[PDB]
Design a protein around this nucleic acid. Sequence first.
RNA 1: UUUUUUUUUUUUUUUUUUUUUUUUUUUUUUUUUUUUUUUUUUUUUUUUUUUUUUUUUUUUUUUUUUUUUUUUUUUUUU
Lengths: 395, 395
Amino acid sequence: SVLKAYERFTLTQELQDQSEEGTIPPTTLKPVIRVFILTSNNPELRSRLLLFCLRIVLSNGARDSHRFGALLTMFSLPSATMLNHVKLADQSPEADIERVEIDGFEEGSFRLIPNARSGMSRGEINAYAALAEDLPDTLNHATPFVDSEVEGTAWDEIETFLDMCYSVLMQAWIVTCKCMQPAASIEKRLQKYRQQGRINPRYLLQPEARRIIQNVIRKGMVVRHFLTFELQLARAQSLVSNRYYAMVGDVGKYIENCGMGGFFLTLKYALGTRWPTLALAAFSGELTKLKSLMALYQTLGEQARYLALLESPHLMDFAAANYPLLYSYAMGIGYVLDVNMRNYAFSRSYMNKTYFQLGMETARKQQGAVDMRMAEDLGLTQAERTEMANTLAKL
Amino acid sequence: SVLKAYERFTLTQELQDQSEEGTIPPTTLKPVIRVFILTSNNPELRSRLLLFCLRIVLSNGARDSHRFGALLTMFSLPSATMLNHVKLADQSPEADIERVEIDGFEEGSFRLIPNARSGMSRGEINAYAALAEDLPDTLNHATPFVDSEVEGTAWDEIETFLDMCYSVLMQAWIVTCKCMQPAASIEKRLQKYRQQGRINPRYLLQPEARRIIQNVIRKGMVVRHFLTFELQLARAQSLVSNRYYAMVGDVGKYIENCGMGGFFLTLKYALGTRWPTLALAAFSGELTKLKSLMALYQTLGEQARYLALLESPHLMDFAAANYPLLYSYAMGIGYVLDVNMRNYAFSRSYMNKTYFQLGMETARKQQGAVDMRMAEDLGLTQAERTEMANTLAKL
RNA sequence: UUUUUUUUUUUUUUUUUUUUUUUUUUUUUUUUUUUUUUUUUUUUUUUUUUUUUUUUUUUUUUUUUUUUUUUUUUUUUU
Ligand SMILES: [Pb+2]
Ligand SMILES: [Pb+2]
Ligand SMILES: [Pb+2]
Ligand SMILES: [Pb+2]
Ligand SMILES: [Pb+2]
Ligand SMILES: [Pb+2]
Ligand SMILES: [Pb+2]
């Protein structure tokens, strides 16, 4: 009963808080991010704006705010109306956006011709043009493209712009929730999307361009908020959709629950396996903690998928330090059960090596073990079980 | 019957008092804390006021009321409106705030230019400027910041002010619930936030600057009240939030339940492990006390997390001396189960060495022990427990 | 005391039908099937013994009180 009090104490303190809806935080000063608005549907203008913006993101000298704005502009370039899609960013409590409606480039470019609506000094028009022509020297051939010719393409048709725009944007999406050498995962993502025809090999970025974009995305909270909103929009899409959002929806599935490996891997291997060692008394308190954490996770809503991206403090609640023994135990199981697990960074401060090996050996010696609620539905006999255990221990 | 009477006696007298919510205490004389108010959003002034205030906090000659007011000012500098957030401090029963609306600095400075609204004698203007030029002599280069040339930056853009402001305030947050060399945790909180980009390494403070800030915060109750009000607001934030409060919410989770290690560690290891020795008759009375204490913790509300910060007398209720045997027993368990536990200051006056070793030995010899409610749901067999038990005597 | 995150995560075989498939014997009836003996009554069957009462049967000792009966250790964090 005192033990019953302790279980209820654990679960309620985790969930008391989350009665109320979130309150929008006290207001704070914000940097202004400038996002470019193109009213024209012209393929050549759209493409040069993408190319223009991509260069500012990668440029040596741009401030973070310039880089963020260029990104937000790129991600809005597929829209029929960019303006509506930029207002998505306004939904971020950290965002202060300046829209900068544009109208075109002085051909040869990248000298901005600004819309009537808002002027620009020829100092800043020229300053941007210099910024678009800076670029690091680590990049090969004055461009970010591995193919020193793409930027010289003739953007006569909208098909071509969209093929590049989606291809460039997909590479940004692929590096969205990576803390950052690596990475094997990235090059396999690229290969999936090439074979699906979502990424066109002509428009791959030099690996250096991607690492810079990865960095800007990790730094930019407003940017990440905007990606979250888009990812949610991709969730609500019909089975019959358009090309971009089907694409975003697919890459979104890799991004979901990013940064929460310790929690979900612990569920998968410790509780998923349902081995007899789960009945240890030591796990008892921690088993209640995971139970609360699952309860907490659903109450959070759809957006619990995006805590890492959102930089939410709730990411702290699910930290493995709250269930160190079970985590250790799960890591060991994960270690033998899956070959890919070796390269997971499971090593940690509170990691208890004793329970780690316990998971390891549990997985080797008790694999013949059966879920007796399954075993009874199948009407398994105890001769069948041991000599089910006798094929698997030998294998 | 006598014993059931004893349980209800223990539990009711602990919770008797807590029906009625608390009444605001009889009024007392208070020192005046002066907080500087800035109406301007200009980056250079915001940055100089932060630097000005930081110097007064660290200054040799400032009196405590000055240090407190300067701290309250720094913590309010991110605000779009400082005046509103300083009124949060007014919610403290120990607080008497004078607002001192400011308007700027005479260039070169730190000579305050005060708002028309409230005048200043040129003696007090010059006196403050002198106070900002005190600083201890142990501090290297007459600045904090480690990097001796940061203060010479040109704070022309709001991004830079915020990048510093958040970086400096975060270091204050990290040292908030520390009683007072070492302090190893501080160095890991710092590298965590550097890796998250929440703290910019350019603006780290010299370790002695932090140790002074540590000291100011523990001395200052109204300051500590204000931090609490901020942590509570950080708690109610949406998943989509702003940069500062996401930051505060995260660091806040380290601060929660500070100063209550004995209670929660006893719960964690003694009750969490659910080992058979918990059935000792000696623990019988103390187990009821813990049961009462958890019950007491819930009645207190969310603010039960901040008892150490609040300086609440309730922090005495949870003192380990009320359950010495269970506490001792728990400490021994933690000591073997967790390597980090060695460095906790578990030694105490009422510490009972017999039960400590008992906790120690319980934790080694009975880890194969199973939670019999789990073991039955998994349908564990009596052979399985033993194969598992010194499977677990083990390693 | 400890308490950010790090792996994996598109698809890929097979996938029309096929034989058999009406009927066919037997299938009214048929014996036996009224009755039949015995079958009123019959002994015993009023009552007569005993059947008032009868001893013992007030009370009776003991039966106020009394020792002890303030306090004292431990008790913030880590
Ligand atoms: Pb504007
Ligand atoms: Pb505008
Ligand atoms: Pb991450
Ligand atoms: Pb006043
Ligand atoms: Pb005033
Ligand atoms: Pb990483
Ligand atoms: Pb007579």
